[PDB]
Every structure is written in structure tokens, then in C-alpha cells.
């Protein structure tokens, strides 16, 4: 029966605006009371707006108080969140939840929102080479440092697909406005450097692709 589909997010810059939308399904969307909950990068959950049944009552927390506005159109079966005067702290996944007689049970899929002032900027790719010959044994693990991109994502591929062989790529980090990330690969010790281990890094915003061959 229930589906809650929110949307309307993207990349805005500080001081911007944005209306979020959330659409109900297989339930009599009117009756129930309702909220917006954001999920931050830090991964804490914070609540942004509260709407009652006949949109009679609105509640917000003091950091959104006066910048966010909640509302609904029963006719269309949707919840609206109107974000105004944006600020970097608001970058987070925004979700909608129906209060099922005080049981927040059904949640949207969510809609990511980024409020950066950055600029599309491709990364810099650096080799992550073993270092001293200190061979642990059969295995040798190389990697790549993809640094200074915005916005995300970046796909990272090893040896143009040919190497799926245990690759690991990590949640990016945000070092003072740009994102960085790492991908690593373990290829058997007698394959490198006799054979070649390049790293493909593509950056779709900037339509980029860099080819860092890893050599000792």
C-alpha cells in the first residue's frame, strides 16, 4: 500500500531558495499529520517542519525557524517544504514522513540537497604506490587519490573494467570545499609492476577522465 516520493533537490548556492515536494500513495493522505526530516552528512537525523491534518498547525526548530515553510495540497496528495535563505548547514538528504497516529512509519526515498558555492572543478589524481619493497606476500595493494573535485560523484575504475578483483572506493571527504576520495586495488604481487595497473577516474560534471598508471 504506501509510497512517499519526495523530490526537487539539487545544487543551489548559499542564499538561494528551493521548494521540496513529497507525494503520497495508497493511503488517505488527508487525515494524517506530517513531517520533514533531514539526514545530514555527519549522519545525524534532524527534523525540519511539522504540519497538521488540515494544515492548521506548523512547528519548526529555531535553526530553520523563519527560513523554511511547510504545506500541503490535499487535492494533489503532496507535502511541500519551502526552503528560503539557504546556508551550507542545510546540505542534507531531505525526507518526508507521515505520522500514523504518532507512529512515524512510512518515509520517502529522500531527495539530496547540496548548498555549496563551489564550482565544477575536476580532480587531481595521484598514484598510491606501495613504497619500500616490504612484500607482505602473494598480495600487493595499490590505490589512487582523487583530490579536489566538486561536485560529486566520480566513478573510479581500474584498468578500464578489466580489474574488478576486489576494488574498494570510499565515501568522499569534504576538505574545505572540495571533495576527495580513494579507491584501492589488490592485484597479485607477481603482476605488478610487470603487468600494468592504471586507474581511470571520470568526473561527469566537468566531463573529465584521467589516466594514472601506478608505478613503483
Amino acid at each position: 500500500e504506501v509510497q512517499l516520493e519526495e523530490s526537487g533537490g539539487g545544487l543551489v548556492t548559499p542564499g538561494g531558495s528551493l521548494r521540496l515536494s513529497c507525494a503520497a500513495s495508497g493511503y488517505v493522505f488527508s487525515t494524517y499529520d506530517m513531517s520533514w526530516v533531514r539526514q545530514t552528512p555527519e549522519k545525524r537525523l534532524e527534523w525540519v517542519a511539522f504540519i497538521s491534518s488540515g494544515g492548521g498547525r506548523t512547528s519548526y526548530p529555531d535553526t530553520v525557524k523563519g527560513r523554511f515553510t511547510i504545506s500541503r495540497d490535499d487535492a494533489k496528495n503532496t507535502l511541500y517544504l519551502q526552503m528560503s535563505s539557504l546556508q551550507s548547514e542545510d546540505t542534507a538528504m531531505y525526507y518526508c514522513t507521515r505520522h500514523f497516529y504518532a507512529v512515524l512509519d512510512y518515509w520517502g526515498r529522500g531527495t539530496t540537497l547540496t548548498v555549496s558555492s563551489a564550482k565544477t572543478t575536476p580532480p587531481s589524481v595521484y598514484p598510491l604506490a606501495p613504497g619500500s619493497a616490504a612484500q607482505t606476500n602473494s598480495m600487493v595493494t595499490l590505490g589512487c587519490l582523487v583530490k579536489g573535485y566538486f561536485p560529486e560523484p566520480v566513478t573510479v575504475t581500474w584498468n578500464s573494467g578489466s580489474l574488478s578483483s576486489g576494488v574498494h572506493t570510499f565515501p568522499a571527504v569534504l576538505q574545505s570545499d572540495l571533495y576527495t576520495l580513494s579507491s584501492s586495488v589488490t592485484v597479485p604481487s607477481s603482476t605488478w609492476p610487470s603487468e600494468t595497473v592504471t586507474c581511470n577516474v571520470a568526473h561527469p560534471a566537468s566531463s573529465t577522465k584521467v589516466d594514472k598508471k601506478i608505478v613503483p
Binding site: 537525523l45 511539522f50 504518532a102 507512529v103 512515524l104 604506490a129 583530490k147 570510499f170 576527495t180
Partner: protein, 210 residues
């Protein structure tokens, strides 16, 4: 007003029972706070488990339970299952607002534990040319998925310029993490020993370089 704390991590085996509480800075937890328990399963998917302190949501199984414990909300899971490994958050209704606690990681032991394999890396010839150096400590293959990472430059504990990624669920229901200690290339040239140490399970593994 507002603080809601929750255990940060609990670990249990399949078959066992675990309780998780929710404390308030306000004082006691009433029924007029509708203790709610959201489940955050692998990949930003959320689900109402229990609402209004004790009402279990439809579809939620038998083992989820709500209770008030010594002025404190509590979630019981009796005979927890492998599928319960996840993050549990609590929300408490503060008349108008909702206050959320930082949610607890719940490991249920679904496969034999295993430790990390740290692999430490030194700033490449190329990045050094930009007068900036970065060392990457790559931590993979651990279950449970909790780690503690400490960096040392010439035996003194690093107290900045280091930042680690939250564990991330490998393909094999094993976790992975990365740590970055960033230096101006100057400093690189200067110290002579860099240690990456990862503490996972009382056991600490350690990788170093010159």
C-alpha cells in the same frame, strides 16, 4: 530543552535479546513524548519500528518492543536476527517539535569476526610538487564494523589534520574505512616517522613509514 542520547554501539549474537535505551536531558521520559524508533537499513532506507512508546507498526515483527525504563525510552529486540544489524534512532515528541537522538549501531553476529588490514601510503612524487602531502591509511575487511584510528608523527599523537571516513559496508558484509592525515609538503620533508594505528576489537594493528 532538547538533548536525547542513545548508546552509540551495542553488539549481540543472533538468538539473544538486546535492549537499547533513550535518555533525555529534560529529565524523565513520559508517554507524552511518543517514544518512536526508526530503523536505518543499508542505504538510507528508513522505517517506523515502534511509535508512541509501545505501538509496533504494521509489518514490524514480534521482537520489536517499546517500554519506558527508569524514565527512559527503550527498544527491546528479543531473539534478534541477522537482518537486524543496522542503525536505530529514537525521536521524542517535545510538544510541537521532534527531538532525535544520535542513533546506535547494532551489530548482530551474522558471520565470524575479522580484523582490518591497514595498508599505509606516502604522498607521491607528483602531489609533492604542489607543496602538499597526503598520506592515506586504508582500512578494509572488518566485522564488526567499528574502528578507532590514531595517527602519530614521530611518536607524538596527531591532534589535527587527520580525518577518517565512517565505516562502509563492503560487498561481503564486511566494512571499510579510510583515513587521511594531510601535511604541507614542508612538514612532510621534516618528521621521519608516520604511524597509522587502527584499534578494532581490543586488538590494535599498526602500519608505519619513514
Amino acid at each position: 530543552q532538547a538533548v536525547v542520547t542513545q548508546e552509540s554501539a551495542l553488539t549481540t549474537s543472533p538468538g539473544e535479546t538486546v535492549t537499547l535505551t533513550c535518555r533525555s536531558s529534560t529529565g524523565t521520559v513520559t508517554t507524552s513524548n511518543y517514544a518512536n524508533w526508526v530503523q536505518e537499513k543499508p542505504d538510507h532506507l528508513f522505517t517506523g519500528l515502534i511509535g508512541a512508546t509501545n505501538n509496533r507498526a504494521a509489518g514490524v515483527p514480534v521482537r520489536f518492543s517499546g517500554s519506558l525504563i527508569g524514565g527512559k525510552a527503550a527498544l527491546t529486540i528479543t531473539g534478534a536476527q541477522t537482518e537486524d544489524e543496522a542503525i536505530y534512532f529514537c525521536a521524542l515528541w517535545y510538544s510541537g517539535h521532534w527531538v532525535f537522538g544520535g542513533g546506535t549501531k547494532l551489530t548482530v553476529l551474522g558471520q565470524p569476526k575479522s580484523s582490518p588490514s591497514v595498508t599505509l601510503f606516502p604522498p607521491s612524487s607528483e602531489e609533492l610538487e604542489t607543496n602538499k602531502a597526503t598520506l592515506v591509511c586504508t582500512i578494509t575487511d572488518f566485522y564488526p564494523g567499528v574502528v578507532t584510528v590514531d595517527w602519530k608523527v614521530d611518536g607524538t599523537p596527531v591532534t589535527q589534520g587527520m580525518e577518517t571516513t565512517q565505516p562502509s559496508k563492503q560487498s561481503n558484509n564486511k566494512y571499510m574505512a579510510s583515513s587521511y592525515l594531510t601535511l604541507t609538503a614542508r612538514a612532510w620533508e621534516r618528521h621521519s616517522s608516520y604511524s597509522c594505528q587502527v584499534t578494532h576489537e581490543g586488538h590494535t594493528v599498526e602500519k608505519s613509514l619513514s
